[PDB]
């Protein structure tokens, strides 16, 4: 029962997902990717035209290709609980449901990098780290911070 539930749900997501992994960074880090590879099926049965939306700008920190906004509301819940400023919001209906400030404003708050870490699928991504590297290429050293206190 649980196995088939997961298989079907992953089937629906990857059905109406875009198909641009080899340019979409977070490819190699993506939850949706690893979750599909480990728990979902292996073949898709779908031919018809998908849905696509226009990308969005949120200042020079978090660029978004909203073609892949899978309607999780992680960013919305973060921006309304931890950040403090209520700008992001989920608007629309049905398959035609986007996430974006309605008056093309920016996001004048900190923790927006935390937004780009929260958002699992690679849509909200750091602009100054646009396409410089995948994750499997670089090594991580665990340090502390000196800018803040």
């Amino acid at each position: 029962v649980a196995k088939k539930a997961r298989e079907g749900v992953m089937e629906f997501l990857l059905m109406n997902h875009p198909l641009d992994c080899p340019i979409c960074d977070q490819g190699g880090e993506c939850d949706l990717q690893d979750q599909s590879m480990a728990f979902g099926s292996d073949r898709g049965r779908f031919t018809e035209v998908k849905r696509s939306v226009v990308d969005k700008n949120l200042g020079p920190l978090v660029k978004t290709v909203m073609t892949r906004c899978i309607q999780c509301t992680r960013c919305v819940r973060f921006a309304t609980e931890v950040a403090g400023v209520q700008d992001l919001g989920m608007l629309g209906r049905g398959s035609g449901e986007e996430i974006g400030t309605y008056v093309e404003k920016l996001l004048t708050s900190e923790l927006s990098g935390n937004v780009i870490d929260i958002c699992p699928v690679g849509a909200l991504t750091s602009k100054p780290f646009a396409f410089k590297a995948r994750n499997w290429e670089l090594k991580g050293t665990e340090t502390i911070d000196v800018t803040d206190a």
Binding site: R43, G44, R45, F46, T47
Partner: protein, 71 residues
């Protein structure tokens, strides 16, 4: 993701859809040969021995006649 890619044109069900054209023609091309076969058809024993001995005797007779002439 397979139906029309494999074959779109006119099938009613997923079976009898494709045309493959991969392997051999009907018949196995031949029965082939694998066993060695080296025919032995040369003059076996007595032919070659008589040839050698007879040509030797006759060559000696010719040497005799020639040495007679030369003397």
């Amino acid at each position: 993701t397979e139906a029309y890619i494999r074959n779109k044109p006119g099938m009613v069900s997923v079976k009898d859809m494709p045309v493959l054209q991969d392997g051999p023609p009907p018949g196995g091309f031949a029965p082939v040969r694998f066993a060695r076969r080296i025919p032995n058809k040369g003059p076996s024993a007595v032919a070659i021995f008589l040839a050698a001995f007879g040509t030797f005797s006759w060559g000696m007779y010719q040497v005799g006649q020639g040495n007679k002439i030369r003397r």
